Structures are given as structure tokens and as C-alpha cells.
Design a protein around this ligand. Sequence first.
Ligand code: FES
Ligand code: K
Ligand code: MG
Ligand code: MG
Ligand code: MG
Ligand code: MG
Ligand code: MG
Ligand code: MG
Ligand code: MG
Ligand code: MG
Lengths: 137, 86, 46, 96, 70, 92, 99, 108
Amino acid sequence: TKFSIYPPIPGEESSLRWAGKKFEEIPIAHIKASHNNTQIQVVSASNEPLAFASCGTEGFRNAKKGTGIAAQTAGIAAAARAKQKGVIHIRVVVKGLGPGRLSAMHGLIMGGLEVISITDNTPIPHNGCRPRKARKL
Amino acid sequence: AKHLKFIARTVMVQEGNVESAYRTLNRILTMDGLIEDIKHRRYYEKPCRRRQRESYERCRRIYNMEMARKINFLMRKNRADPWQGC
Amino acid sequence: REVLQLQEEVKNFITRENLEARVEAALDSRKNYNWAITREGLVVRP
Amino acid sequence: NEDLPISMENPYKEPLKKCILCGKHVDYKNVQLLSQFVSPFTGCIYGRHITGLCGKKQKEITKAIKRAQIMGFMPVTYKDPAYLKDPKVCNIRYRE
Amino acid sequence: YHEDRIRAKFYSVYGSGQRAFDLFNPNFKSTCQRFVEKYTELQKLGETDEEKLFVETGKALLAEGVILRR
Amino acid sequence: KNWLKKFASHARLRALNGLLYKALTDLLCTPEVSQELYDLNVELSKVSLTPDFSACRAYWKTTLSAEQNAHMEAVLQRSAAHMRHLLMSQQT
Amino acid sequence: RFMEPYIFGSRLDHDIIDLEQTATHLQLALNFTAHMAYRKGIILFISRNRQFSYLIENMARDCGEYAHTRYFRGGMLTNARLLFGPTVRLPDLIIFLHT
Amino acid sequence: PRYELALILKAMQRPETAATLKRTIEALMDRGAIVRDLENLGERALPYRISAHSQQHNRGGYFLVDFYAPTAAVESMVEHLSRDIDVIRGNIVKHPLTQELKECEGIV
RNA sequence: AAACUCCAGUUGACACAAAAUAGACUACGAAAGUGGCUUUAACAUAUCUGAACACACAAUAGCUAAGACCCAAACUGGGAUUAGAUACCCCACUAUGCUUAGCCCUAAACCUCAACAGUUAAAUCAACAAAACUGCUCGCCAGAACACUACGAGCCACAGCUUAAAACUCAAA
Ligand code: FES
Ligand SMILES: [K+]
Ligand SMILES: [Mg+2]
Ligand SMILES: [Mg+2]
Ligand SMILES: [Mg+2]
Ligand SMILES: [Mg+2]
Ligand SMILES: [Mg+2]
Ligand SMILES: [Mg+2]
Ligand SMILES: [Mg+2]
Ligand SMILES: [Mg+2]
């Protein structure tokens, strides 16, 4: 059977399973990759928080939070605390274009979790609020 | 917010190749124009500047395509000289 | 011709007398407006 | 002389090219057809350089998509997954 | 020329002949040119109905032994 | 504006260098410039602005292979103008 | 534009030269050439089409006339005294196979 | 003129849907309309979650009402559709069949 | 560094704000302007020209009354900085940007091309800009500066707008 790049539909029954569970039952790792910080929260499919880790909660301060290594460490910490609650497979939902967009996922993988899908949910207004003016540096 | 989740901007991992899935997602977001929109929305672009930028980009594309067409049309003559000496 | 077409068409309009029967008949019916186009310009009905 | 040329319109003139939707009605209720011209992953409407439509039908499709989206017939942020297997008419490849 | 119209529609119906043109021969005779000459002959020996002339000329050429795939 | 003819015809410095380094890294993080550039995975070491603001030197780390170095150099030189345009269009 | 009076018409976007006019023009040109050759005038053929340089040089050598199929240096005709000598005789007739 | 009402009704059982359809068509007639037909497009999942009358809806029944009404009726009808608690979303458009299918010769 | 920790992440509810993609289109309108969806009204004139002042309009900014306030933001505070720091960066927050009823009447309000009708033959043509011209009408211009000024007059404008000089001076501009 040809691999489908598209995620499974909740309604349409599918045979894809991960440790016996359907796609819509897998825990979700929400990564928020800001410009100066990366925050990772693992939640259950029913939206029950299991683990949380940010670059600041891992000891990094000021500019050191906005690096790849800090996001990787936060990912490892989140993956460890999620492993301690029975999480193996995760669906990654990444929001933002910060330096830790990919390093947090790397840290999650090195912490033992298996990523089955990647979703981007970066906020894109259809021209709502007015952004701030450019910096005159 | 009111839409179903895990349908938009979602990519499945093939045989644990997370890097390939991430790069495919980056390509999708780039060719759909979302990356440039996000980066251009960080600061407000004035309407006159926005219009000037779009006009410049459109005319740059047109000029580049015309130049490429001219070069490709004239490439056919670039072969070995059939009347060498004379 | 338009007038005659309208004259024959009004016979099937919904009125206060046939409202309930038509409502039930519609409830037991389905209409599909969806169809797709191919690269060759051919309509593919569902 | 009878061998002289005569005035006429070009008889070898090939017919003008037409878009795939030429002569066909675009309805906002036909979510299936409208879904063929939006991105599967973002729901963004494809430009004419991708769809290959003429300006008139490009405008018709755009207006129909917006009408269906605001009147609760079509999703906005993605293509309805029920139509993901419909024939591909757009010149775009994600190498997925 | 007049026959150009015939030629055009010939080239639109039977297509370009699988036979090859020989422009070096000053009196080369293509399949389309044979069709044109027969069309004009029937026109001067009959009525003026473009579709009827075309079908009749096709029948005549097939009778003579010229293949013509639409 | 007759485009056809147009085509036919210090503390501040350090902050600017840091800003430009971050912006250039973020530009190279995606296929925004080009897919060919993205596939090469260019890493930047630093950005240096000349004292009179006449050029921006972006120092990229070289690899061990020489054919790859030459190809990456060619792609970067061909993409420099587009990256400049992107930097000014994003109002960095 | 100046070639329009000599064009019979356009056949499927390809111009056709009216050969009836070509006949009279060629008659006049050949008559002029023959009269010049009778008077022992110097005749120079000129053409920059490299496909026919050899042919034109052979023809000029055969009829006892002169050919210039090569790069035309600035001042052959308008500066002939400096480039050939003070007593050089210029051509009495020049024939362009390619203008 | 000729109008088309696209109605997204609450996902109800058959009797309530019948009553709502009767009420809507009766309102149309009371505003001076002549109803031509009523088409049921089916019950389906909404493209997005719609909040109406202090209730969240993920599913709805789609119906089409073709009718002829005076121009003054439309506004009034809109108000009525805003008050019906069993209507998730009602929209009146000019009937697409009235729009003329202008013919073109192709790409210039 | 200040600031916040009634903070932050997921989920749900939730605008008097702004309208991704389409638009690589070049449309509508007298101009100014106009790019989310539906509906109702609706885009003058079968010669042309015809006004600083007549009659109706005029981006942005600004001013009266009321209202809304997400975000942005002149000013105003605070944080950080040389050796008189960054006006510039960071944080907070005004007038203002929005709606309603009135003012004000200015723009690189520019295609820096006055409106209509016509021509492509002439030497094409100071230059550059945007090929060169013809007929007809209205408007306007006759060295620089004084001067987008003074005075007079008009204006819901009160050091505001429109019209707009003279003296002295110079051989240039
Ligand atoms: S070419 Fe016929 S409608 Fe597009
Ligand atoms: K301008
Ligand atoms: Mg007038
Ligand atoms: Mg006057
Ligand atoms: Mg104004
Ligand atoms: Mg104001
Ligand atoms: Mg305010
Ligand atoms: Mg005028
Ligand atoms: Mg003067
Ligand atoms: Mg004044």
C-alpha cells in the first residue's frame, strides 16, 4: 500500500495503528518556537497536560534561551518527563519560526519519543491586527 | 480555531524519516507563500512601499523571462563553425 | 415561448396547499451539485 | 489573370485555445470543482499560472470559493479531505 | 487561393498525409493536391454543397485506391 | 516608471553585524531563497560590515570536499542579490 | 519598408518577391555590368556570407575581376590612398551578392 | 427577482426539520414570495464549527429554497432568519440560473 | 536592564478593529480613491470647447460635538547605553488611525503630458524625458531675487487657505 503523506481522517476508517492506538488517540507535543524562547508541552489526545519544558525552565537565561542547544535540552527534558507517563509516539504541532523550531523536535527524538506526524500552526492573520513599525537601526 | 485540527499543514513521517518530513513541510509552506507572509508580517509595510515592491517584482520577473527566452533562442546558433577558414 | 414555459412550470411550484407533502418529499430526497473537471476538460460526475 | 491571389480570411487559422472550464457554469455549491483549485495543505487559492484558467474563469472561481467559504460550504484553511483523490488539474508539485 | 480552404479542411479532417512531401520535384503531387483537383472537378461537374463535395471526393479517392484515415 | 529602460541601462556596527548574522541564518534556514541553496545546508560563522557600509561580508564555514566547496560558492554568489532583496523587503 | 514595392505578397507570413520586377531589375543590372566590363572597368564583388566566400572568390578569379569576402576594414574606399598607395585605382563598379 | 436561499439548519430529527422547513417557507410566503422548489442537499459535517443562538454546531442539514420575491422582501427575510433558533446560517443570493452564461471565443 | 508573574502552554467561549491566498490580474470611478461576503439603489449628456471666484466634490494630517478601543502610535514617563551616550534599541501609555453629524480645503493632488478632432507624410528630431506633428478652444506665461511674501478682498478657516504686488539690488538667474 502506497504511503499517504496526508494525515488519517477521524471519520474515514484507516488501518494505520501505533502500538494499537489510532491516529486521533496519540499524544500531541506542542512546540512554540519564539525568537528568544522555545516552550514544549506534551498533552494527551483528550488535552490532559503530561509534561512541560521550556528553555527558561532548563536554566538558560537571556540570549542563551534563543539557541538550538537550549531548545534541544528542553525537548530532551519534555521527552523524559513524558516517557515517565507512558508516552512513546507523539504528533508534533510546531508554532513559530524561531531558532528552536527543529532543535526541539530533535531533542524530543533524542529523549526517546517517536514522531509520527509534523503539523505547523504558526499564526497567520488574514490581515487583522496592524504590526509594529520597523526598527530604524 | 473553528476548523478541524491535524488536516492543514500536516505531514506524515515515512519510515521514521523525520528530517525528510520536516523539509517537505518547509517546502510546502514556502511554495504556498506562507513563509514569506509570516516574515513580511513581522513589521508593517506601508502601502506605497508595498505597491512599489510588487511592481518591481512583477517587472523583474517579466524582464528575466524575456532575457531567458532571448538567450535560449540564440543558443541554437552556438555550434561548431561550418565554414572554418572562410 | 418564455410565457408558456412559465405557465407550464408554475404547476410544480410550492403552495400553501402542498407545503407539507413537498417538505416530506424533499426530506426523503437528495440532490448533488458536485462534479469535477479533468485536464482534458471533461466533466466527471460523482 | 485567374492565377492571381484572392482576398479571404486565413483558412488555416487554428481555433483560439480555451481553458478547461470554458463554457461551463461555476457554482458556489459545487465544492468539489472549487476544491480542485486550492492548496491541499493550506486551502490557499492557486493563481492562474498554476490553474491555467483564463482571467474570467479565474475570477469566477475566486468569487465562488469566497462565497462558499463564507456561507459554510467549504473549509478555508485546508482542502476538504473528501476531495483529495479528485483529478489533478493544477501545475504544482510538492514532491510529497 | 480558393483551394486553400479545401486544403485547410482536408488537413483538419484527414490530417497531414503519412506520405512525405518532395519539394525538389517541380511537379510533386501530394494526397491533398489530388483531393483538391478531384474536389474542383466535382464542383465543375455538379452542384455547390461543400459537405457533399467533401464526402463525395473522399469516396472517389478511396475508390481510386488512396488511403485516407480520419 | 519605464522599467524596461531601467533594466536596460563602533558600537552601531557590531549591533548591525549581529542583526544581519541572525537574519542571514534565518534566511538560509528555509527554501525561501532557493531549494538548491536550502539543500546545501550552508552554515555562517560571522557577518562583518566594512567601516563605510560599502559591503557586507558573510563568512561561511567551508567543508573538506573541494567540489562541494566550489558548488556552494557558486550558488552563494548567484543567490547574494536575492538575499539582499529579501533582507530589504522584510525590513530587517 | 523600402522593399515593399518589390514584394508580390506574403504566403503564410513568408514574403514572396515579385519575379516580374526581379526580371527587369536584373536585366538592367546585368546590362550595366556587361557595359562596365566592356570598358575595362575594375569590378569588385563583395559579400560577407561565409557560406559562399569560396564560390565568390572562385568566380571573381575566373572572370578576371576582384573579390572581397573578408572582414571589411575601415577605410578601404574612403581612405584608399593611405591604405594602398597614392596611385591606387579604385573599383569602377561594386557588386553586392549580400548587402 | 429570483432568489436562492441556502439554509444550514440544526441537526435535528425528521419532525423538527420538517417543522422548521414549513415555518421558513411560510415566512417566505408571508413576505410575498412564490416558492418554486425545495432541494435537500443532505446532512453533513460543517466546514467549521459554527456558533449560533448560544449553541455550537459541528453538523448541519443543507437545504436550498428557490423562490421569486419582491426586492423589499429580502431584507425582511434576512431579519427573520436571524431570529430562528433552528437555523445555523441562512443566506439569500441571486439565483445563479438568472446569471447569464456569456460565451467566449477562447484565449486571445 | 526594566516590565509582568491577576505570568506562561494546551483547550473552549469571544470585536464599532483590519480584510492572507486569488492579484504573475490591471478592472471600476470626474479626480481624490476603490481589492472579506450577501442583498437593495446605482455609475449624467447622440456635436465639441467652456470658470482661482458660479454649482458640486477633493488622500493624509488637523479641529468641533458624542461613542468604540484589539493593535499601531506623534508626544509623555521609565530601562539600557559614551564620556555631553542611541533622536534610533527595550517597556508602558496618550492625541490620532475607527463610527455618527459638522468643519478645514492642503499634497511629488504627477503620466510632472489641458480638452476635443485628425495624420504618419515630411527635414523625424536643440538636449533629455515619453516618436513627430496638424486643426480648434479655454487656461496660463514674458530676466533673477524681493515673494508659496506685504497690502487689499473673500472664506464656518483667526500667525489658516485662495488671489497676489511695489520699492531698493544684480548681470545674470
Ligand atoms: S477561455 Fe473560455 S471561459 Fe476561459
Ligand atoms: K508621480
Ligand atoms: Mg463642457
Ligand atoms: Mg478667469
Ligand atoms: Mg480633505
Ligand atoms: Mg481625522
Ligand atoms: Mg486611543
Ligand atoms: Mg480644460
Ligand atoms: Mg521676475
Ligand atoms: Mg499667504
